Write a protein that binds this ligand. Structure first.
Ligand code: MET
Length: 517
């Protein structure tokens, strides 16, 4: 089914300035979106801000300014950050948007009509910071900003409070069987696998109904009213999760502003999401609540939720990008960490990867095959006959796109990078064995073959690395003189797509500059 590939980030609470957490989540969303655009697919990537709720309102009250002013300002800080980071997100959604609120009301009303929302009570624990209902098994003893004894969440460590409110309740308990059927029929719907298993174990244990409204005083009147009941506000999470639906329904102009909300999601061919990128801290809301709501409303379910290893709720990414380069930092963040906190994020390791992989492996190779000493005609040469060693390298280059494609689709961007760099290491080894610098004087016919394979390997690896290194990839292709048309599209994943006789671009000038150890 040819639709628009729909990839999302979470929408971030505006209680606080943007930091690495949000940058990382949105980076992953951006990389996926970029890969599918490189593949030649229609893409709509979404990110944004989560602006209502008790947590934000109390942050605004702490800074002594109105919630409207506060949210608008911080939303601006997030936008500025994502421009600075040079993402290619198609739209930035804010839950304060009137068209978003409209959608929330439509969805709420649908749930109510299907009989899945009733008036009840929630009596139990709540983490305002996580906007999360917790059971007594999920709390323990801790301390508040003072240092007084209190209760805190086991999930997150933030303070919990007991809540006793008459609330509108969603009949989540009724969706346990269908959610379990969903997880089992779609065993790749949650990545990584151990997080999928975690969700299943949880839903197996049983599901309580879920409070989807709060008394308006509690949220300092900073939330969406419940349709037909002004005394209640819609739970920030139902509000927040609904952004995905809203985004799927907005026509957006070339400038990036929302201009229209379509009635039927199918008009824009985005819903449901093909990939929801989230942090591990909000898995339950996306893998349990969200699909339960969609099941109630008869809406289609997302294909994949990928939950990465860091919590999204001192290390300044803009500052490090100014120091080491933007693409470099992006490469590091995506290469250093798989689905764990077990990444080494120090300057030592940043420089180690910068010098070792980016400069020594990739950059060095680019200069070798474009060098005036080795590539004396400044062109793609026409290869002669291939040796078995030539063919071994060629096979790797041919196999690479299929391998990288699967990884990007899991999605597992770390493994995609590793796969490309395995081939880059192999090309370097080949170049070292063939010693093309010596062949310029000794065997020009042989050099043609060696140089051509090298150039082609570099092009193909660069193409598959272009979602990770969007700017540097362009520089590389410019050096190789690859025409624009060949920088995109699955047809150009194939070996030999750039014909011999193509001229290299002019030289000026380093690709990645190494740094003091
Ligand atoms: C619908 S995604 C909501 C995410 C939440 N606002 C957070 O920052 O953790």
């Amino acid at each position: 089914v040819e639709k628009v590939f729909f990839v999302t980030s979470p929408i971030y609470y505006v209680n606080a300035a943007p930091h690495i957490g949000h940058v990382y989540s949105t980076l992953i969303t951006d990389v996926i979106g970029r890969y599918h655009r490189v593949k030649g697919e229609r893409v709509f990537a979404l990110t944004g801000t989560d602006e209502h709720g008790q947590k934000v309102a109390e942050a605004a009250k702490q800074k002594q300014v109105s919630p409207y002013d506060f949210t608008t300002a911080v939303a601006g800080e997030f936008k500025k950050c994502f421009e600075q980071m040079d993402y290619s997100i198609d739209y930035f959604i804010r839950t304060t948007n009137e068209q978003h609120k409209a959608v929330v009301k439509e969805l709420w009303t649908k749930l109510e009509q299907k009989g899945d929302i009733y008036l009840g009570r929630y009596e139990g624990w709540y983490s305002i910071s996580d906007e999360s209902f917790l059971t007594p098994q999920n709390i323990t003893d801790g301390v508040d900003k003072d240092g007084n004894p209190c209760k805190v969440s086991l999930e997150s460590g933030h303070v919990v409070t007991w809540v006793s409110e008459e609330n509108y309740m969603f009949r989540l308990s009724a969706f346990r069987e269908r959610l379990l059927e969903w997880y089992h029929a779609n065993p790749g719907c949650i990545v990584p696998e151990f997080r999928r298993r975690e969700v299943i174990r949880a839903v197996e244990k049983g599901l309580p109904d879920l409070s989807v409204s709060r008394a308006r005083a509690t949220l300092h009147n900073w939330a969406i009213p419940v349709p037909g009941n002004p005394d209640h506000c819609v739970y920030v999470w139902l509000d927040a999760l609904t952004n995905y639906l809203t985004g799927s329904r907005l026509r957006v102009d070339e400038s990036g502003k929302e201009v229209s909300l379509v009635d039927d999601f199918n008009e824009l061919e985005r819903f449901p999401a093909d990939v929801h990128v989230i942090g591990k801290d909000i898995l339950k809301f996306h893998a349990i609540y969200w699909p339960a709501f969609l099941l109630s409303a008869g809406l289609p379910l997302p294909k994949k939720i990928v939950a990465h290893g860091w919590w999204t709720k001192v290390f300044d990414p803009v500052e490090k990008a100014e120091e080491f380069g933007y693409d470099a930092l992006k490469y590091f963040l995506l290469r250093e960490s798989g689905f764990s906190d077990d990444g080494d994020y120090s300057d030592k390791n940043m420089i180690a990867r910068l010098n070792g992989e980016l400069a020594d492996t990739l950059g060095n190779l680019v200069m070798r095959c474009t060098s005036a000493k080795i590539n004396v005609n400044g062109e793609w040469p026409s290869p002669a006959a291939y040796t078995e060693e030539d063919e071994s390298l060629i096979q790797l280059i041919k196999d690479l796109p299929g391998t990288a494609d699967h990884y990007y689709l899991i999605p597992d961007i770390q493994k995609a990078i590793i796969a490309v760099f395995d081939v880059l290491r192999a090309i370097n080894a080949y170049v070292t064995d063939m010693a093309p610098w010596k062949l310029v004087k000794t065997d020009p016919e042989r050099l043609r073959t060696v140089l051509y394979i090298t150039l082609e390997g570099v092009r193909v690896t660069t193409l598959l690395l272009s979602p990770i290194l969007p700017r540097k990839s362009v520089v590389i292709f410019d050096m190789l003189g690859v025409p624009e048309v060949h920088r995109k599209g699955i047809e150009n994943f194939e070996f030999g797509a750039v014909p011999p006789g193509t001229r290299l671009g002019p030289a000026v000038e380093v690709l990645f500059s190494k740094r003091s150890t």
